[PDB]
Amino acid sequence: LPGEGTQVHPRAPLLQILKVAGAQEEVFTVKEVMHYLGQYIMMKQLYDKQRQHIVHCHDDPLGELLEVGSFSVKNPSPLYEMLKRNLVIL
C-alpha cells in the first residue's frame, strides 16, 4: 500500500462504506481511509462487546469486501489485502 501523503480513490463498494461513516470526498490518503473504516465499525458496533479487538463483519457489507466473517485489529492483513483490491493509486 502507498505511503503517507499518497492519494487514493476507493472503488464503488468501498466508497459506499466510507460514505456511511461520513466521508464527503472521493480522494483520500490511506490513513484517512482507515479513519473512516474505524468510524464505520464503531458506529455500526461491529466490534465484539467483550473483546473489542475482534470485529464481526459477517452479514455486513464490510464482510463482503474483507471476504472473512471476523478479523482481529491486531492481525490486520485482511484489511490491507482488501484495500489493495479496492484502492486506485493516484
Partner: peptide, 14 residues
C-alpha cells in the same frame, strides 16, 4: 479492557 476506538487508533497511527 481497551475500547475498539483506542485499539483501532493504535493501528491507524502505527
Amino acid at each position: 479492557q481497551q475500547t475498539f476506538x483506542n485499539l483501532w487508533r493504535l493501528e491507524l497511527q502505527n
